[PDB]
Structure 1
Amino acid sequence: MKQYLELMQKVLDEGTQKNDRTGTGTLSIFGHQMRFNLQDGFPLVTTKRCHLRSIIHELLWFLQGDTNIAYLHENNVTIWDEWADENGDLGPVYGKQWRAWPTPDGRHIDQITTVLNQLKNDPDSRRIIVSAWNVGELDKMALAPCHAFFQFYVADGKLSCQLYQRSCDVFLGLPFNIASYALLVHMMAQQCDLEVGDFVWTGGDTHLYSNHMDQTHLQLSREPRPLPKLIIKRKPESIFDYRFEDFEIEGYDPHPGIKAPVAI
């Protein structure tokens, strides 16, 4: 992908050497925004092979309000394992804030039903927002929300979404995180009878880890191949109703996978 490749180049050319949490040096820039028009094709990186299945399964887990790893395990999805305790609990992380944000008076606010209410009945709102940055619960979560905050916008029957990501690893994390939300703009739009507009990605500490240098050089040498097309095979009766098999990606010919290790 072109916008992504432009970002990769930029953190190599402009980033400051900054450390991780007593770890790995990174090259970091701060403050980057990229726009993906979803009508031009699905934003899945063609410059290295990326697979959709852990992406799809992790999102359906978010939408269920699940905070325990069990569902992912049933499906041999392992990405959150690193974070979960013995009984598979992750603390009040994303699914929890999204579907049952706790109030000081005992309520649990379902932010994505709110968002669907707002998109059908008041599409012109400037407050169509869901947040996972619940300050009162940050101390109990495995990790603090990386994609912390996002907002929808409707103009001319096109639903667009801006995401605020506080910290992103451009090589390993970012391809995954761009396709997860593009999937979500497409579930949302089908459920609201709106067309897809844009996915705007804004980031904060946007970084390359230094032991991913050869891999980014490899990748920056590859020409972006055309973008695939996502097809949702069923219109479920609601957004908490999609199932893994409702999704197909057609026309994707990526260049090979590049693996990249992590310090520990």
Structure 2
Amino acid sequence: MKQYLELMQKVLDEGTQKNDRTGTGTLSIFGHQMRFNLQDGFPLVTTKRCHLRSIIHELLWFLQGDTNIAYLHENNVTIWDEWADENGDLGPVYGKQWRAWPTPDGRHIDQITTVLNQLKNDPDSRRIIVSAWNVGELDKMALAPCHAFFQFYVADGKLSCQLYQRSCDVFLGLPFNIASYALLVHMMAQQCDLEVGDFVWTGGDTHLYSNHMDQTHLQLSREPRPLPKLIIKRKPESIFDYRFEDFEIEGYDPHPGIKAPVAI
């Protein structure tokens, strides 16, 4: 997509040499922002084929709040397998914070129901936020949330959403991060009888791994294709009742998929 390729080129042009926790070198910049008008089309990268099956199941699983990977395994979605323990547990990652953030007094706060309620009853609110950055629970999580917090906003009948992503692998994760939250904006908007606005992506440590340099140069030589269109085939009674088959991406005509490896 134009904004995504511009970010890639920017990391290449001005990223500084920087290692990760494993020791794998990266080129990195700190602080970046992109805006996708969801009325322009579903923001799925077209310069490489990106599959969404895993992403759709992951979002449904996030919304359900149980952090054991059983549901993902029932659907053969293996993207969380490397972090799960022997029982399929991950600790209180994303979903547990979204749906049942634990307080000091023993309550479990459902942030998704809170924001839905706020979008329907107080759309002007400047505090329609969901955070997964539960400081007291970080140590128990299999990994700290990368997509740490997000805020909603309503103007002129349109729902917008901004995500703060503390750490972003531009090549491997970003395309999926964008699509995930874009999908969630469509779902929230549908549930609040709103049109879709913009998805604003904000990044913290934004990087390209050095072993993704060939892939990055190849992707940069391709021209973005017209964006596809998200169609929601059914309107569920609530944000917790969406099903995998409700979503269809129409008009996706990407350039070929590009594999990128990870070090261990």
User: Normalised by the shorter chain, which TM-score bucket?
Assistant: over 0.9
Q: CA deviation at 1:159?
A: 0.3
Q: CA deviation at 1:92?
A: 0.4
Deviation sequence 1:179-236 (CA, Å, 0-9, x none): 0000000000000000000000000000000000000000000000000000000000
> Aligned partners of 1:216, 1:98: CA distance in 2, in Å?
33
> Aligned partners of 2:22, 2:189: CA distance in 1, in Å?
42
> Aligned partners of 1:89, 1:148: CA distance in 2, in Å?
20
Q: CA deviation at 1:28?
A: 0.3
- Which runs of 5 or more residues in structure 2 are unaligned? none
> Aligned partners of 1:129, 1:22: CA distance in 2, in Å?
32
Deviation sequence 1:6-34 (CA, Å, 0-9, x none): 00000000000011114210000000000
> Aligned partners of 2:82, 2:223: CA distance in 1, in Å?
33
TM-score (norm 2): 1.00
**3-state secondary structure, aligned to 1:188:** helix
Q: Is the 8 A contact 1:23 1:263 kept in 2?
A: no
Instruction: Give the corresponding residue for 2:106.
Output: 106
Deviation sequence 1:57-116 (CA, Å, 0-9, x none): 000000000201110111010000010001110000000000000010010000000000
> Aligned partners of 2:257, 2:231: CA distance in 1, in Å?
23
> Aligned partners of 1:21, 1:182: CA distance in 2, in Å?
29
> Aligned partners of 1:49, 1:61: CA distance in 2, in Å?
23
> Aligned partners of 1:121, 1:234: CA distance in 2, in Å?
24
Deviation sequence 1:128-167 (CA, Å, 0-9, x none): 0000000000000000010000000000000000000000
**3-state secondary structure, aligned to 1:248:** strand
**3-state secondary structure, aligned to 1:9:** helix
- Which runs of 5 or more residues in structure 1 are unaligned? none
What is the aligned residue count? Answer: 264
Identity of aligned residues (%): 100
> Aligned partners of 1:117, 1:71: CA distance in 2, in Å?
27
Q: CA deviation at 1:52?
A: 1.2
**3-state secondary structure, aligned to 2:36:** strand
Q: Is the 8 A contact 1:92 1:141 kept in 2?
A: yes
> Aligned partners of 1:238, 1:22: CA distance in 2, in Å?
41
TM-score (norm 1): 1.00
> Aligned partners of 1:80, 1:256: CA distance in 2, in Å?
25
Instruction: Give the corresponding residue for 2:17.
Output: 17
Structure 1 range deviating more: 140-149 or 16-25? 16-25
> Aligned partners of 2:18, 2:249: CA distance in 1, in Å?
37
